[PDB]
């Protein structure tokens, strides 16, 4: 819906794969994160001392309040602000959980498996926070 808002969306990725198929050329699987039609990524201009290439993706939920059908996508697609239609199982984030909870604040698992690649042992892991800015009860 629409209303009132102020909140940081705080996402982490932890490194997942999948990102390149090429080890010279790239692949259209760039480690970036959309909320509701925000897609951005981190700059990593520093050494990359760090093996995540996500580092971790943050929102501004000034102006748009965090709902229960808003959904967070992941490298799976160019972008996707309304899902609805089942998937089969992309990375497709239910930010519903994080408001379902007092902690404001939940864990995922979502590897990009190419379709039939279900994981066993080796699983992408999102984290989903909602920070309220002026402390509201959405």
Same mark, same amino acid.
């Given at each position: %819906?629409?209303?009132?808002? %102020?909140?940081?969306?705080?996402?982490? &990725?932890? =490194? @997942?794969?999948?990102?390149? !198929?090429?080890? !010279?050329? &790239?692949?259209?699987? =760039?480690?970036? @994160?959309?909320? /509701?039609?925000?897609?951005?990524? !981190?700059?990593?201009?520093?050494?990359?001392?760090?093996?995540?290439?996500?580092? %971790?993706?943050?929102?501004?939920?000034?102006?748009?309040?965090?709902? $229960?059908?808003?959904? +967070?996508?992941?490298?799976?697609?160019?972008?996707?602000?309304?899902?609805?239609?089942?998937?089969? %199982?992309?990375?497709?984030?239910?930010?519903?959980?994080? +408001? /379902?909870?007092?902690?404001?604040? /939940?864990?995922?698992? /979502?590897? #990009?498996?190419? !379709?039939?690649? $279900?994981?066993?042992? @080796?699983? +992408?892991? #999102?984290?989903?926070? =909602?920070?309220?800015?002026?402390? @509201?009860? #959405?």
């Amino acid at each position: %819906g629409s209303g009132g808002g %102020g909140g940081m969306l705080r996402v982490f &990725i932890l =490194y @997942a794969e999948n990102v390149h !198929t090429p080890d !010279t050329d &790239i692949s259209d699987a =760039y480690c970036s @994160a959309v909320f /509701a039609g925000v897609k951005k990524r !981190t700059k990593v201009i520093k050494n990359s001392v760090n093996p995540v290439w996500n580092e %971790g993706f943050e929102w501004d939920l000034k102006g748009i309040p965090l709902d $229960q059908g808003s959904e +967070l996508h992941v490298v799976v697609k160019d972008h996707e602000t309304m899902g609805r239609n089942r998937f089969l %199982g992309e990375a497709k984030v239910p930010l519903r959980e994080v +408001l /379902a909870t007092p902690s404001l604040s /939940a864990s995922f698992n /979502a590897p #990009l498996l190419d !379709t039939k690649k $279900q994981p066993t042992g @080796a699983s +992408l892991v #999102l984290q989903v926070s =909602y920070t309220p800015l002026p402390g @509201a009860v #959405l």
